[PDB]
Amino acid sequence: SMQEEDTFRELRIFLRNVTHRLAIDKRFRVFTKPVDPDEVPDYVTVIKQPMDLSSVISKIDLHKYLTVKDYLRDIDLICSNALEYNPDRDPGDRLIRHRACALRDTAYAIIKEELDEDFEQLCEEIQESR
Ligand SMILES: [Cl-]
């Protein structure tokens, strides 16, 4: 229905705002663009499901997220990809892991404070209906 389309539109507006807020944070600059294979030729061979905030915006605009649950799975991928590709004790890897965990924690904290649980439940019920 048009009411269900309105619901998903509101979801996309909400997710674009959350994503924008993460992307303008200087801590999260490394997560804003795909890894350039030049710098990191082994990336695409180790990480099977690359994810970055530009890819998340693209997915929002392609109507790929019908729930906040599905969006947070891609935020979790940004975090787990960084924990897997950068696992060493050296400060460069520790800095990326801390920034990845902070992205993930920030996204979850914004959603906890600003997402209505009944709006998420409605999205989940429309998604399951199809
Ligand atoms: Cl830096």
Residue numbers in the entry: 979 to 1108
What's in the article?
Bromodomain-containing proteins are a prominent class of epigenetic readers that recognize acetylated lysine residues, typically on histones. BRD4, a member of the bromodomain and extraterminal subfamily, which in fact contains two bromodomains, is perhaps the most widely studied family member and has been shown to be very amenable to binding druglike molecules. ATAD2 was proposed from computational druggability analysis to be less tractable than BRD4, attributed in part to it lacking the hydrophobic region present in the BRD4 ligand binding site, termed the “WPF shelf”, interactions with which are postulated to contribute significantly to ligand binding affinity. We demonstrate the utility of FragLites in mapping the binding sites of bromodomain proteins BRD4 and ATAD2 and demonstrate that FragLite mapping is comparable to a full fragment screen in identifying ligand binding sites and key interactions.
The remaining hits for ATAD2 (13/16) and BRD4 (9/26) were bound in allosteric pockets of their respective proteins. However, a halogen bond constitutes the primary interaction (other than lipophilic interactions) in the absence of a hydrogen bond only for FL10 and 23 in ATAD2, and FL2, 4, 21, and 24 for BRD4. In both ATAD2 and BRD4, while the majority (22/42) of binding events involved ligands that contacted only one molecule, a significant fraction (FL2, 4, 5, 7, 10, 11, 12, 15, 19, 21, 22, and 24 in BRD4 and FL1, 2, 6, 7, 10, 28, and 29 in ATAD2) were involved in contacts with more than one protein molecule in the lattice. As such, the hits for these FragLites may not occur in solution.
